[PDB]
Design a protein around this nucleic acid. Structure first.
Ligand SMILES: [Mg+2]
Ligand SMILES: [Mg+2]
Ligand SMILES: [Zn+2]
Ligand SMILES: [Zn+2]
Ligand SMILES: [Zn+2]
Length: 142
RNA sequence: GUUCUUCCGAGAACAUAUACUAAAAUUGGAACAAUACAGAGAAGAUUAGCAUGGCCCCUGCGCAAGGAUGACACGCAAAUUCGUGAAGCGUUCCAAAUUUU
């Protein structure tokens, strides 16, 4: 992924790189672990869950923790360590805990509705447990 | 759940209904390979073909071209209706040459 950006990592990179290298180690496993004993949906869910974390790490480091500047943060987006289309949601009021992108999309559903996991999951029902088909998210609004 | 309110443990905004919903459990439909056995249209025989028909297909992009001319067609071939004069009958047969005590 560093060959894709030609310029070298800016100054902060030593801090994030040990973590970012572990997310790649996870993702190579999740790409390759056997597709048997799991539902046809479940096998995809590790990909989205690791992708969500990795973007959330880069996002938390700059926005919550300020431990990377702008130039390294924007470097991470350009390298594609971070899902920056998704991060654009987390900035939004009311989406700050979002799972993937596909659950907000609406247009890919049958009835033109966002996914179920959004549904202020407090409001939804007294006891209903949920694992939405796109990414197994249990409820990402609170 | 996260950002704001404060009298303080509550309130306000944002956010709003995914999924042939299965890691299954049941239950069907096609084509294969080939034992021993004989022969695939055209008034004797050897044989191109092109058509015709439809609850029959196959190869083909196909209104081309192929598959035995792809196969089948292959007889009791019976569909609107009569008109004539003879004869049994009506219940019934069949017979003494001559001649002597
Ligand atoms: Mg002949
Ligand atoms: Mg032929
Ligand atoms: Zn979600
Ligand atoms: Zn999702
Ligand atoms: Zn969802």
């Amino acid at each position: 992924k560093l060959r894709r950006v030609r310029k070298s990592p800016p100054e902060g990179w030593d801090l994030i790189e040990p973590t970012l290298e572990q997310f790649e180690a996870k993702m190579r496993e999740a790409e390759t672990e056997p597709h048997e004993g799991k539902r046809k949906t479940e096998i995809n869910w590790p990909i989205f869950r690791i992708h969500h974390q990795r973007s959330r790490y880069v996002y938390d480091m700059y926005y919550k923790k300020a431990e990377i500047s702008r130039e390294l943060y924007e470097f991470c987006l350009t390298a594609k360590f971070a899902d920056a289309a998704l991060i654009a949601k987390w900035k939004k009021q009311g989406y700050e805990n979002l799972c993937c992108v596909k659950c907000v999309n609406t247009r890919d559903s049958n009835f033109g509705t966002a996914c179920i996991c959004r549904v202020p999951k407090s409001k939804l029902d007294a006891e209903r447990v949920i694992e939405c088909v796109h990414c197994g998210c249990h409820g990402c609004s609170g």
